[PDB]
Amino acid sequence: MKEQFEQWVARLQISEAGQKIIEKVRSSEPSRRVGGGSKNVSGRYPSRKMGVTIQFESHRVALPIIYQLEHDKDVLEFYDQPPQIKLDYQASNGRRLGVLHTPDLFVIRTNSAGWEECKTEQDLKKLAEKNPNRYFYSEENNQWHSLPGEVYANQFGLYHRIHSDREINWVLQRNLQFLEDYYRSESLVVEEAIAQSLLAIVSSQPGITLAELLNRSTGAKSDDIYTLIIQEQIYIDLNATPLAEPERCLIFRDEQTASAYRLSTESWQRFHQASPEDQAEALERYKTIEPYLNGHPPENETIPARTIRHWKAKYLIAIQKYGCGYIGLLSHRSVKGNRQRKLPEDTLAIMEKFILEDYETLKQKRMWEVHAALVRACEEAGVIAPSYKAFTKEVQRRTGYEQTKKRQGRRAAYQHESFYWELAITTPRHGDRPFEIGHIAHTELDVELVCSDTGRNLGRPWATFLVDAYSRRLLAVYLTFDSPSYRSCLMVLRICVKRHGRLPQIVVVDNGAEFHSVYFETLLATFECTKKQRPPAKARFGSVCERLFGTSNTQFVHNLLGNTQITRNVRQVTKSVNPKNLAVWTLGLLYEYLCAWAYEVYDTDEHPALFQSPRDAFAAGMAIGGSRVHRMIPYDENFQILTLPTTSEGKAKVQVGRGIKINYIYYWSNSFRDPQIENTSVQIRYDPFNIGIAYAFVRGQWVQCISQYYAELQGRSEKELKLASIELRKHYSNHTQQSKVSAKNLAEFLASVEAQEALLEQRSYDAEVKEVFRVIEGG
């Protein structure tokens, strides 16, 4: 690895300091973690070129360039958040200021290396118009250039480039997202007979569309066809027409054959100015004049002669100097009116100022009081005071996002925020095929649950939903009494990779903690899922998922006893209507019926946005887009130990005669008796739902480890362990003697304490979720 870089440097004769920067960029963690911001969907993407997770601030600006670089051959490497560069530049005044700047990407190619910064259209124009000597446009190459970035590049043997989103071909992006699953595979081997069959069918017919080839009964599937596509045996232009639309994509054997096969206004504006009532009036005028235009005038005409004559004269005038005479009969009532403001200008200015500085303020003052204050100020200033109706009417002219944000806040103004309306064909909002974009979201189900055995109320369970954005099919549903914590995530994803088969490609997930954790990100990296993050307080970015909660309310949850629906009006609640006295459901049965609804009731129901049931859309998409059996994750023991979490370090030492220390407990295995792995660090994994069992990576295999308290620490969860540890620390804090926390104290706490309300609540929660586990496992 180092020798090839050294030969690269020698061939390109990069200076000592340039080699120093390249070496620093190559071996360094990214400077800053990408922040959600307020308008950018952020996240991480797995790259097989580098073989690591690369962070993008914007999924439609920087991410397309990342996709290109990942699938570009000229690029060797592309680091993200390279170390800051102190760009020196003279501003408009003339002062030469040095501003720290972090380029979006640092790209090392086969003949050059340097910095690449991703921006948008309007950002580039505002920065250019606000900084003449920092950005400018070269129409020769049609590229945006930054003076200090390129200057620093030229002082170091490197290059500097600005990637905008004008030059990105979105058809290319769609096709890359289509074939990324086949790209990530490593042993694509199409059967020779089937490949020959397709080669014959392709060579017998040039320009054959993808849809008209897939439908042929050649004993083949779509996985085979797309595998031939990705290996360039069959040439499809991944630059003009997307593969998601297989009815507009011609297929050719090679590139050469594909290339050969490829090789008055004012009057109309007057009509546009008309109203349906004006149109009807013009029609009436035409019907009145028409007998006078045919030599057969009527003997009974109520309309007087002068108006008929004027209409006829204007008809002739229009047919002379316009081209058509009907357009001369247009009234255009909209221009009429008195739009002049009747209030004096000083009265306006004062009332504008008062609406600005006394109504839209962090007080939510009512209109009457602000009008009264305005009237008092006007009477002090000797100007005309507007009436209350005028104040209410103008306040009604300021409604929308700005006023709601300046009065209630940014959370309340979000309803009237905006809709991003697609002009061109960007990447589709809800994906192109099944298992492309899946959203993950949790909620607190509005239903009270009693204990299965003792019958005491347990509260409202939490529901975790993973749902694909294409077919709306509820991919995986989970129910647990606990708050949002990884266990949640291991679970939904276990079921996903269990009853279905694999997993998403882009998984959006809000800015939780369960998602900013190390475990979820590491698992997504391991299984190569692009992690996308919506900005804080913004909900439309997972809107398709979130509304699936509301449906679950109306179709299954709000039609149950003890639902937490009437508690929205807390002020109207009585002991006769409290759901904690009406609740009868349990966690296991509620989960069972929720799964039934999500898997065979909502699954067979037709969707307005698909005109088919989610299962039918799923089947059609996976038939058109291929089954992609290679990306299947088999639900076996290997996946079982792969989903399990671990500590912060990742590995633990094997102390002789004691084992490995995980979460205050010690774990031992037979293979630990071997001195080869004794007093050495081995990777550890811990089961959150069964503490008494862990796993250790020894001699190229995960091996189970059992704690020394199996009869006393089996079946317990880890949340109960932290509860016991905290209570033990507090109980020993009731005394001055400092007894350290070890395994035996926790063991006798578990074997002695049985009536603690919080601990009993925890054991009840674990016993309840055990039945959900059994229901998942087929019981």
Binding site: E29, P30, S31, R32, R33, R44, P46, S47, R48, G51, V52, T53, I54, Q55, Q81, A513, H516, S517, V518, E521, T522, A525, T526, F527, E528, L642
Partner: peptide
């Protein structure tokens, strides 16, 4: 910051 993971470059792939 507070509660935010360090900007580590996570390896990918199933071992």
């Amino acid at each position: 910051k507070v509660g935010k993971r360090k900007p580590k470059r996570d390896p990918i792939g199933v071992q």
